[PDB]
Design a protein around this ligand. Structure first.
Ligand code: HEM
Ligand SMILES: CC1(C)[C@@H]2CC[C@@]1(C)C(=O)C2
Ligand SMILES: [C-]#N
Length: 404
């Protein structure tokens, strides 16, 4: 716990640790939900991780992400040093500067790309699941959650699969550091990996994601090697962590809820809707912004330079946004959430994300309609910029499956 700033009132102190929440054993989302208990203020200050503010309700989370004139993405991560080393593009930029680079990235992961990858996405999912089907068991995180979205991304990026172990390790230290490496070191290592690749792809322009970025233009002029590295770096982290973790959260839930499995099996056309509801309930991201000047937010005096965590994960779990938030209802009328962010930085890979999610659910339930958490297993979650599932052992009776 760091020394409490002079301008922060004692009653707003709620020592929540984002990389190791106290009620984590009850489930990572539940651990964060504590910030929304009846007594907890809308905006509290935690002396943990160097010290920072934490907006706990969707109304404040949304407003902050919308007001980029006060809440700047220049320093988006906690701890401070990580937020200061963080220079990925376009996430470390604010409008209007951000807009030009965001258009180029949208060109490599946007919906048009999701359409080009449709077949490979479909093929890989079915292939991985069919290989697992006869086994009657699997380590979901290692056997599907990771390989499915990561191999698709490496394919798009035109990068050898043999590089996955290294890159996944680095991305992981940026979102849920184990301690061995600082954000800055992990970031430098990732950039080191990319520098030669970007240079080769600028000499021999190709069709892959790195070549498209590196040979691209930003609102009319040539992107720089430095800018390309900063953009590609972000893309790798984006393609290697969130979807991977989200899939495990969703499968864990379905593995524990026979009735929800029944519903999608009976009405597959509801899968897209179920995807959205799961995204709300199992939202998993939480980054933030930095104050550009002294500003009073919701009755609370914020100081220039202060860091504020705006958990994208919290908005959808807020009862003021969704009645009975911890409950999963695929028929929920108005599924409100900020799972893919809010404001001008709304996730660019959300379309690739939903496709991977929907395909996974459709193809998995198609072949392995019935499954459960392995006997006696206790699922462990992890927390950080991107929260996730440590391991997910599943089992099923091969006799109930079907090859398609
Ligand atoms: C379940 C999956 C995913 C979730 C929940 C998610 C969530 C988010 C969130 C919350 C942001 C904004 C953070 C901020 O405002 O500081 C974001 C940004 C971004 N995401 Fe994702 N994302 C997902 C999948 C992907 C995938 C598959 C990619 C593809 C590589 C990707 C690429 C990006 C990019 C490029 C940005 C930066 C946009 C900008 O700063 O303007 N995301 N994502
Ligand atoms: C917070 C994010 C999910 C968003 C894209 C990947 C991520 C970890 C970032 O650094 C920006
Ligand atoms: C976006 N990961």
């Amino acid at each position: 716990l760091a020394p409490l700033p002079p301008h922060v009132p004692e009653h707003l102190v709620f020592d929540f640790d984002m990389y190791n929440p106290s009620n984590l054993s009850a489930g990572v989302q539940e651990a964060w939900a504590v910030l929304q208990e009846s007594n907890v203020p809308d905006l509290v200050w935690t002396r943990c991780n160097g010290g920072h503010w934490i907006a706990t309700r969707g109304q404040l989370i949304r407003e902050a992400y919308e007001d980029y004139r006060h809440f700047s993405s220049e320093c988006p991560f906690i701890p401070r040093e990580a937020g200061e080393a963080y220079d990925f593009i376009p996430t470390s930029m604010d409008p209007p500067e951000q807009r030009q680079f965001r258009a180029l990235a949208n060109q490599v992961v946007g919906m048009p790309v999701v359409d080009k990858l449709e077949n490979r996405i479909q093929e890989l999912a079915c292939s991985l699941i069919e290989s697992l089907r006869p086994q009657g068991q699997c380590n979901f995180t290692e056997d599907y959650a990771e390989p499915f979205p990561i191999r698709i991304f490496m394919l798009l990026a035109g990068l050898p699969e043999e590089d996955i172990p290294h890159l996944k390790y680095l991305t992981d230290q940026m979102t849920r550091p184990d301690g061995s490496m600082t954000f800055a070191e992990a970031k430098e290592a990732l950039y080191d990996y990319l520098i030669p690749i970007i240079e080769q792809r600028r000499q021999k322009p190709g069709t892959d994601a790195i070549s498209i970025v590196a040979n691209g233009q930003v609102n009319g002029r040539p992107i720089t090697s430095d800018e390309a590295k900063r953009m590609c770096g972000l893309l790798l982290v984006g393609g290697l962590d969130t979807v991977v973790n989200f899939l495990s959260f969703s499968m864990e839930f379905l593995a524990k809820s026979p009735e929800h499995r029944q519903e999608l099996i009976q009405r597959p056309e509801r899968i897209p809707a179920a995807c959205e509801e799961l995204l709300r309930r199992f939202s998993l991201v939480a980054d933030g912004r930095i104050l550009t000047s002294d500003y009073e937010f919701h009755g609370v005096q914020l100081k220039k330079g202060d860091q504020i965590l705006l958990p994208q994960m919290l908005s959808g779990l807020d009862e003021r946004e969704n009645a009975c938030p911890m409950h999963v209802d695929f028929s929920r009328q108005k599924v409100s959430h900020t799972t893919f962010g809010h404001g001008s930085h709304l996730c660019l890979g959300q379309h690739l994300a939903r496709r991977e999610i929907i395909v996974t659910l459709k193809e998995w339930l198609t072949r392995i309609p019935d499954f459960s958490i392995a006997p006696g297993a206790q699922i462990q979650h992890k927390s950080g910029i991107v929260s996730g599932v440590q391991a997910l052992p599943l089992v099923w009776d091969p006799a109930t499956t079907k090859a398609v």
